Design a protein around this nucleic acid. Sequence first.
RNA 1: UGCUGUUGCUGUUAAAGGGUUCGUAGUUGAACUGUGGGCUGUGCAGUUCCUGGUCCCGUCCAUGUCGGAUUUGGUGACCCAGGCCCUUGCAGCCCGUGAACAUUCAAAGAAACAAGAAACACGGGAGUGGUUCCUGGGCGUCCGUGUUUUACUGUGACUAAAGAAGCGUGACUAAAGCAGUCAUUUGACUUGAAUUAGAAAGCAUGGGAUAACAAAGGAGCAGCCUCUAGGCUACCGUUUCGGCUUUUGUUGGUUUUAAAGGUCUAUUGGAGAUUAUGGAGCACGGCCUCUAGGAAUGAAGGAGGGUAGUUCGGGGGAGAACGUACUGGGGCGUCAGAGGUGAAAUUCUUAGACCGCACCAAGACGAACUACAGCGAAGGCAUUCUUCAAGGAUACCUUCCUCAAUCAAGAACCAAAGUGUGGAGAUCGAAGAUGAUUAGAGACCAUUGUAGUCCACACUGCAAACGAUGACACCCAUGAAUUGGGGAUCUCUAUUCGCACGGGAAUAUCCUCAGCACACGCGAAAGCUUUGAGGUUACAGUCUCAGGGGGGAGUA
Lengths: 129, 72, 142, 82, 141
Amino acid sequence: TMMSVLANALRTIASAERRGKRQVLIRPSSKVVVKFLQVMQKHGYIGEFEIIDDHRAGKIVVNLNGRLNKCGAICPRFDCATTDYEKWMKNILPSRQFGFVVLTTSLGIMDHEEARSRNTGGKVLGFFY
Amino acid sequence: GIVHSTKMHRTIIIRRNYLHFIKKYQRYQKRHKSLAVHCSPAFDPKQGDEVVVGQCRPLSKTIRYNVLEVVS
Amino acid sequence: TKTNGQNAARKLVRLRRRNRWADKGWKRAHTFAAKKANPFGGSSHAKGIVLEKIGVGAKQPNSAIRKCVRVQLIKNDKKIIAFVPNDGCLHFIEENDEVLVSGFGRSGHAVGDIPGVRFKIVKVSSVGLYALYRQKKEKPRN
Amino acid sequence: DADLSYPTVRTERMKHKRRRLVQGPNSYFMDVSCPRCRQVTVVYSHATTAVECKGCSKKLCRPTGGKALLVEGCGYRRKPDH
Amino acid sequence: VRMHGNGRGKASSALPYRRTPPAWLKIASRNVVKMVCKSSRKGMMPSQIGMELRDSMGIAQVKNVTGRKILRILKHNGLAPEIPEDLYFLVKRATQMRKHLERHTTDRDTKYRLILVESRIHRLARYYKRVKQLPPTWKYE
RNA sequence: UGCUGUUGCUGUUAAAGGGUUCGUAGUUGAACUGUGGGCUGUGCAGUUCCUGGUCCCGUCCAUGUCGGAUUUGGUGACCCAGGCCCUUGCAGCCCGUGAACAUUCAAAGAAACAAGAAACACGGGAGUGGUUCCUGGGCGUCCGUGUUUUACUGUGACUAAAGAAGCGUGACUAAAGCAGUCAUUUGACUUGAAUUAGAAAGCAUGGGAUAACAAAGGAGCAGCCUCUAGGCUACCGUUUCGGCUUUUGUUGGUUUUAAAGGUCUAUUGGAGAUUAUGGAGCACGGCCUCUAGGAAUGAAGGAGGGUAGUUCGGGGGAGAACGUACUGGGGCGUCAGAGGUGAAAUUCUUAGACCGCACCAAGACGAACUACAGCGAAGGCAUUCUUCAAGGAUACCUUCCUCAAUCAAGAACCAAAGUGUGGAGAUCGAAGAUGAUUAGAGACCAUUGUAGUCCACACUGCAAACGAUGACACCCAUGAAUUGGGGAUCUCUAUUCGCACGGGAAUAUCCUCAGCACACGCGAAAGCUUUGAGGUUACAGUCUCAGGGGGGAGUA
């Protein structure tokens, strides 16, 4: 019973970053798991993927460069109006400098900083410091 | 709304389903309201059909609405 | 553990209504069971008549005889053993004197070393009791 | 030393078929030739059924649980995958 | 995990990535489609039809040769069974256990294994009505 | 007061996981339809040509096997390099694309066409548009004829003052107030009195990632378009006579012709997402035939189902037996004690106990093998043979295609003792009796003994029902083991046994799935660990149950 396929995905990345692994192999890839990872990769927290075809649901193989402290998923996916970036910045991120909160917006999966500038709000997905 | 039950003569009960938002817990809730709605014999809705429903003057005791359209 | 979901807000609202009753500082605020039994009936002070002067042997390792009074509340007709707060002040109280009674200050329970005494006298015949003890006013003769 | 995305021969020869990176089959078709008549029938590795020659009906294999036993020196030829 | 009872065991066919039929199959689609139906007129189910093809006749997957699964092939020819076969083999177990328990009324183990099997039937019969593949008045008895 | 916990608690031992399983309302629910391109200038990263600083080749030695050097060495290897728009990717910018593919090319994609489009095309109105708008085409208006919402988010409308936030302002300051300030008089400031928030719901309109609703369930279907010619043909309406399109000057009446549509035949051009010159039947061919059928995402280290080893097991029901033992009874012998205890005594004995052989009768029970073993949802389950339905695990390129997870209410099962009616009654044995012990002692000990213990059919549902640890899912290192099933050896290949339940059985090496068990991190500590109490203030995978100082009390 895989309820959220990000929950399973970003834990593995999280809990295999805490062990210093060079690579992680993630069980059910999905359109959201990729778009989330490609945001991690934009800011330098992950090296590379392989998305392997099983013909059913892929298997992502991520190269870790050692720079992730944590990866969450926020499970119920609460909303954000663009005025609510300050709650999430405040509660879930360590400092007001270096964290990132990842959202789904009309425009897509993007950072809370890519969202403030485009003015969309959306639903929260997770974070990474 | 959906057509809940047809058993009245020339009238019908629609249930209108909605989610209600409780602030403290930041989550939703199933709720519903049911209406007495008059169906002109032009229409023949069956249980389960979405229906468009208009405002009327009070007709029976509980009937303020009237079936405009049957969507199926 | 608890239940989590966007649409789950019944379970959460219900689950708190049920689990607050397990709370006591308020299993107190919600029971008339509290009000019927507080001989003041909810009010901060009350006036009684002095029925009887009473020594109460102090509790546990402390030895003393604490100077207490029975009281007949004028509201409720209930009877209350109240404490006379200071030196010799039981001399300012006579039987059948009207007396204003207050709590000890742990709301419904006795202040340690007087067994089961929840109330103390603040006034005797409309003159304050500490204002008589400390000498300020003279007890009106009537 | 190892990549997860390109594993060595020795690691993945060991794994369960479902635990492979791929999910492959463990089975293959053999090309079987009946001893009693010279005739050739394709036979599935794990048969799970009585399999008979077409001309003569010989019961060319046993159902046995894991991997079917071919009968009495009948010639097997293993077919390709593709 | 498992529907009723606790096993976690995992054993399944693992279908290949490569879906083109082998080179050594010289059997035309219409010759497969006719085998299916020919052997379904012998009163067979699909879950077996597909065996006699991979066992003896060497057709691994009928979708991969014939364009289509073993039931569209039957549903198109009107040979499709009246009750889905996952539902037929449960009713068939439940009834034998009902016949078992009719002599043996102290056998508690199979009185509990019914309670499971019947509760399945009512879940499938709830699926196959919702999905419209059973008549909405279908009932156990 | 994170002691009510959505943010945000706790539940092995502190208070707290229901005894187990099924299961409705409810909550939660897997993947997929989807990197748009090319051109220019400019920032990044990964084959022309030039190096000779390497290893390889070779030479000289030959050195028994750990020297070496040797030049050209050698398009070999290699390298550090270049404003090569030859490279590819990539950042940023300009800008073009009917822009995948196909299709058109006329004055600049016009027309047809492809795609989209109801915010649309298709016909129509002068009582449309400030006197019928613009330059044969085009907008505006109205009507007739022929398919998407919602949450969420952005913006915007719509909303009493006081109150709260806020701008301005020296009421002497301040709590306030909405005032005042300035010339210089016989007014000036266009005098100020801004602005914001204000659950939910309702309104309009952008966005379309994540989600929800509805529909589907795949043979439960399904339209090829187009030029022209001909033929026939009212059109609606019905209860009886009803309706009817302009033009002919107008109205009433009649009637024709004509288009329209329909329908029948005729072939003009082109399609087609599934081969008709094809399949089928009687290597080529006819003949005769019968004539739609293949266009569907996938098959989840999710669920259900199938078949196989006549696989695995103290799993469950039934029927026959079997085994020694406790007790009892005769038979057969013997003669004085036996039993029981710390020591005795109550109890049994010349009317023959104890003891010893062989049996017979009855009821229970399944020792040793028996384990940190197996099976079962838990409770529980141990002789053999037959027998009846099942159950898991494994094997598989079978089948199916979301059917699922957890669960108020509800249902079934639940050890021992109990309870009801019949049976049984060997052993043990609540109550009871007796002897000891003791200051006392029905107690603990001993000889007894009723209910009971056993069985069938009904109830009860009250355990330290324990792992004091809810269920489903994921991640997680090590060593030797173990029970099922499977695979390889027939770099590991090897041992022992030899028609008949047997091309067999067990073992060895290695792998693998599934079961019970004997580094991180966490924890108040004890300790837990791929069988979690770990991956949690860096707090969020899902459902549910219970706890909130000790008593009173699981009482009234």
